[PDB]
Design a protein around this nucleic acid. Sequence first.
RNA 1: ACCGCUGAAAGCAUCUAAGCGGGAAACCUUCUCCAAGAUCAGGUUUCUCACCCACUUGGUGGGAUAAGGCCCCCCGCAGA
RNA 2: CUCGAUGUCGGCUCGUCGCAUCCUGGGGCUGGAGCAGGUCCCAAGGGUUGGGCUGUUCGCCCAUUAAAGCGGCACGCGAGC
Lengths: 174, 146, 37, 60, 213
Amino acid sequence: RIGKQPIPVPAGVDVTIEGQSISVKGPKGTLGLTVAEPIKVARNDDGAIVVTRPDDERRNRSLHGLSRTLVSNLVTGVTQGYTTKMEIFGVGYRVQLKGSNLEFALGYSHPVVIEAPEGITFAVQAPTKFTVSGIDKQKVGQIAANIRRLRRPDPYKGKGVRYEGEQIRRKVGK
Amino acid sequence: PTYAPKAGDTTRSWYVIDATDVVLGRLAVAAANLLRGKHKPTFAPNVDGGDFVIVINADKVAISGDKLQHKMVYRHSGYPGGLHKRTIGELMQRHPDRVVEKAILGMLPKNRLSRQIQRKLRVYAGPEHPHSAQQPVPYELKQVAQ
Amino acid sequence: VKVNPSVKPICDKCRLIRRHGRVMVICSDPRHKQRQG
Amino acid sequence: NAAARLNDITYNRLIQGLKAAGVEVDRKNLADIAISDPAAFTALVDVARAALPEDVNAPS
Amino acid sequence: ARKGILGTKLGMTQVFDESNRVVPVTVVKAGPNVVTRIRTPERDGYSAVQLAYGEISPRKVNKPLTGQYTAAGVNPRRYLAELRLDDSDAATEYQVGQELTAEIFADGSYVDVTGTSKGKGFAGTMKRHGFRGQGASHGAQAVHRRPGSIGGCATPARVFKGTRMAGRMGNDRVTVLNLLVHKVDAENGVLLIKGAVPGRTGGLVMVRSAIKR
RNA sequence: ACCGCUGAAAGCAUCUAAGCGGGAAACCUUCUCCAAGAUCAGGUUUCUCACCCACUUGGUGGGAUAAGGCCCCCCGCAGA
RNA sequence: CUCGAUGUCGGCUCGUCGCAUCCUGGGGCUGGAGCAGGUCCCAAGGGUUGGGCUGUUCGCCCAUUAAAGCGGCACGCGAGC
Ligand SMILES: [Mg+2]
Ligand SMILES: [Mg+2]
Ligand SMILES: [Mg+2]
Ligand SMILES: [Mg+2]
Ligand SMILES: [Mg+2]
Ligand SMILES: [Mg+2]
Ligand SMILES: [Mg+2]
Ligand SMILES: [Mg+2]
Ligand SMILES: [Mg+2]
Ligand SMILES: [Mg+2]
Ligand SMILES: [Mg+2]
Ligand SMILES: [Mg+2]
Ligand SMILES: [Mg+2]
Ligand SMILES: [Mg+2]
Ligand SMILES: [Mg+2]
Ligand SMILES: [Mg+2]
Ligand SMILES: [Mg+2]
Ligand SMILES: [Mg+2]
Ligand SMILES: [Mg+2]
Ligand SMILES: [Mg+2]
Ligand SMILES: [Zn+2]
């Protein structure tokens, strides 16, 4: 089902194809992506993105649904970016900024600092809540997963770092 | 009596083999046939006939991606537990002219005269070779149809 | 994980997948994790 | 085999075409024309190419 | 970024510091040096600096070695060694003809002193390698200091390479790491180096700056 | 080993099939030593940089030198 | 295979290798609160004590230790003792 479907363009001011290549620019910065060579890409009548394949192989059906939900993740984040909302639980655990960085107090004997890479923008909203923002979906979730593993999971007191809305497992202990 | 080549009759020439999209085992075979003079009708197995082979672009030879992870090169130093090992993937970063060379030398006969034949091989990593004083004619890999 | 040369799902929400050339059982319950070996 | 692959034929299809044309030269003298007279070796390869069948992989 | 000097071990004395502790030092005459050559990567493939040390009479130096000094404009010295730098920054602080005296090191700097160990001759295995030997009684017949076994049995039918046996001991390049400079003395050209330094009293010594600290 | 991110075949889900991460006293570099007999016998330099005879005139035999070294001599904390 | 000879247990000296890991290093699950543990997976770089009794190997015991691993090599090693 995925891949037999057109992808809209709100602005997309540089939708270009130069030897199986693609780019996208708009309210945010630019991105780049290379599609595997049995899959082609072109423009529909509305400027929409439709990808095709030589039919009925195991290796072409997998890359066809793959290379649709990456192009649609380029034209999304350039127009409407990605934010991951994260919550700090546990008593005495909080979060601050120091410039562009983000320092944690996770019960350790030293503060824990997270250097934000070239494109990931931090912003707290509360002392125990913050959001990780950026334009590339794969690059945002990589940095959010580095913050999630900053404590070993504690299912007895629930202390640690979580995504918002997710429910970790809990045991009873003593 | 059948022909036996006198000394002073083996003419030689210079060939350059671009290695850009050629597998390691085709290019070793075609270089080792060319070093020994199998292609010349004056072949005699005790006489070093055959030509000079230059192999440029050794870092672009075609190796399957699952061999660079897994195919190993073993060496031993004579000392106990001196079996040192590398992979092809961590020789193509350092010495891409040794991978194309080692494939050729195992295809030459294991005798004294192949120690004289392997002196006629130059293998280079980049697209530029210093032997422009000679005139190496380029050599494409043929296959005679049948 | 439990590493045994016979793996099969235990409860009704274990899933039996194949990643990296080996058969393993992933689940929400952590003590149902298995792989062949 | 070396003198046949310069006239773009194999040793395989050279012995076949010489037998199909009725040329009974032994391999001693056929490997001495290959050195001492390379222009008459080609005139033999052109006879072993004409008497060879039209599709060599077709069943006979 | 790695200072060095050539010098001569002059022996060991003892001295005291401000906390009234005794410090066994090795007096090294880090004498005056001169450059004579600069190795560059565009010419030589690496980056180093030569150093000349020692007073020699100009008749004891032969004509090939003499003309190597005439190109540099330096009177001929006895010794001549190199200081290996990293891949850059040689000809920014060394020139041909410069005078490197002993005060390129500070006090409380850590140095690496390399040299040539004293000769011990043809030595046995209880001295060259620390073998225990056999007993001195209880029936032991003429094997008091001998090695004992040297291999297996009919598998393998050989002695493995690198088997520790008797031979000649010493006269090796030995680098001693992270020795403490106690007092630099620019009046006499003398470094007081805390501890032991490889060599006999009079031998050549390269004092480089440490990297492990 | 194991924990992941993005994501299809399989509208969901999955660490993987395309692609990218974190990750051990093991492996490779870094530090110490040997090492161009590495016969692919390496590099940067300076010095001498020159004569005579015989013969079947040959990348030919001898003789005498230069730079430089060895032997002898006085010895060594270098050493069978 | 060796009878016109292939010297046997233990100990001493000197070793090298495997991993089926005793310690140290990285982990999953736990009927893991914490501290200590159990179990399984990865890992062979180094380290792995000295005594009493016994010809002993093995084993019990004493005092420690981060721990006092298990095996191959003619049950390694007598032209070495
Ligand atoms: Mg054979
Ligand atoms: Mg993996
Ligand atoms: Mg002595
Ligand atoms: Mg000692
Ligand atoms: Mg003793
Ligand atoms: Mg006796
Ligand atoms: Mg005695
Ligand atoms: Mg024996
Ligand atoms: Mg590391
Ligand atoms: Mg050296
Ligand atoms: Mg040389
Ligand atoms: Mg006998
Ligand atoms: Mg555990
Ligand atoms: Mg294991
Ligand atoms: Mg061990
Ligand atoms: Mg290591
Ligand atoms: Mg053992
Ligand atoms: Mg034993
Ligand atoms: Mg035995
Ligand atoms: Mg015995
Ligand atoms: Zn389950």
